[PDB]
Design a protein around this ligand. Structure first.
Ligand code: NI
Ligand code: NI
Lengths: 73, 68
């Protein structure tokens, strides 16, 4: 997992203003686990309009399928 | 940490319908919450869960994902 591409792809996602507290570590299984705090734009409900896009991108681009994404304004 | 008491308090929170993928390790907590679909959980649920986990369990390193 290239942490720079992960950061770039998070900030490249429509409706993402910023992020912090990105953690990416290996589970016992050796599979990637990710947590992140995302500040979404005021115009989008991120549950509907950002979360599915971040899930899709993290799976497709990084093979990360164990995700917990929190949104703040 | 009593996961049974964490479970009760999460489910006791207004706007919470269910949760899964609760993980607590050295304390850090992650969880997936299904909110009531009539509630945007970003203002009506998230701060409430964060203050409850702080008050009741001394847990402040939290990541809560709302979905479904
Ligand atoms: Ni945060
Ligand atoms: Ni889930």
């Amino acid at each position: 997992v290239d942490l720079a591409e992960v950061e770039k792809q998070i900030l490249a996602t429509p409706g993402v203003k910023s992020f912090h507290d990105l953690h990416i570590w290996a589970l016992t299984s050796g599979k990637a686990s990710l947590t992140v705090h995302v500040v979404n734009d005021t115009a989008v409900n991120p549950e509907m309009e950002v979360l599915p896009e971040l899930k899709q991108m993290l799976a497709d681009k990084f093979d990360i399928t164990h995700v917990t994404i929190q949104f703040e304004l």
